[PDB]
Design a protein around this ligand. Structure first.
Ligand code: NAG
Ligand code: NAG
Ligand code: NAG
Lengths: 50, 50, 43, 40, 50
């Protein structure tokens, strides 16, 4: 699980651009305030390599 | 992939023939340059994104 | 003496630093934790 | 690109010679210059 | 390219490496190893009338 990808972001990246910011994403109308919960998910998820 | 490593290749002579002849790489696909012409050209501002 | 370039100017993103101090000209690309008021100050 | 001239802004022509071509490949949207203080 | 390499009197600036004519074809080049500036002139040609 050492390899992670950005599942959620507000906008698409530019060419040759890396995003490593571990900020929470707001998927709904309600603000998340940096805390996980309903419709608040972490952007980086790990691959299940077996 | 979210934190992909970019390495600069500079001030070296590169033999690309040893990359083509080896069989472990499933995909060797080039877009802006011919694969067989890489040994005959000179380049700068070279980066490997891993 | 120099300039600071970036997007958020912190360790979250990657930033470019150009400085010329008393001896030599240094160009660095690092993830700097920049000051709100960065400056230089014989030096 | 840089140019040094021995001298509001003067009215004249001076082409800026390219000084550094830098391969960064990073996003830049905001900048800030660095000054030097004098302490007494 | 195919041409005659001759001495040149064109004062290239330090950043400048090669030169381009009206047609955008290279007319002068800076040789590696020696850093000298060589003028490139196309080889002698003309029409043959019988
Ligand atoms: C660079 O950053 C700005 C805001 O910080 C953002 O809007 C833009 O999409 C970024 N560019 C790329 C290529 O990601
Ligand atoms: C100037 O900066 C470089 C890199 O940070 C450093 O090695 C050098 O000692 C500095 N010069 C002085 C006089 O502090
Ligand atoms: C090799 O080329 C460099 C320029 O890249 C030059 O400074 C050096 O003098 C050359 N050496 C020889 C032996 O030609």
């Amino acid at each position: 699980y050492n390899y992670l990808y950005r599942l959620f972001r507000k906008s698409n990246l530019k060419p040759f651009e890396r995003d490593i910011s571990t900020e929470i994403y707001q998927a709904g109308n309600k603000p998340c305030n940096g805390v996980a919960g309903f419709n608040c998910y972490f952007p980086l998820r790990s691959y299940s390599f077996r | 992939v979210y934190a992909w490593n970019r390495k600069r290749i500079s001030n070296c002579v590169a033999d690309y023939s040893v990359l083509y002849n080896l069989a472990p790489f499933f995909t060797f696909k080039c877009y802006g340059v011919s694969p067989t012409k890489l040994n005959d050209l000179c380049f700068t501002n070279v980066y490997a994104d891993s | 003496r120099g300039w600071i370039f970036g997007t958020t100017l912190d360790s979250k993103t990657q930033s470019l630093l150009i400085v010329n101090n008393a001896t030599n000209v240094v160009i660095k690309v690092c993830e700097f934790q920049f000051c709100n008021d960065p400056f230089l100050d014989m030096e | 690109y840089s140019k040094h001239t021995p001298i509001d802004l003067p009215q004249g022509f001076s082409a800026l010679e390219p000084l550094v071509d830098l391969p960064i490949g990073i996003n830049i949207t905001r900048f800030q210059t660095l000054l030097a203080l004098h302490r007494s | 390219g195919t041409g005659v390499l001759t001495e040149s009197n064109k004062k290239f600036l330090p950043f400048q490496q090669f030169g381009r004519d009206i047609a955008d074809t290279t007319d002068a080049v800076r040789d590696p190893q020696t850093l000298e500036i060589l003028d490139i002139t196309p080889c002698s040609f003309g029409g043959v009338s019988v």
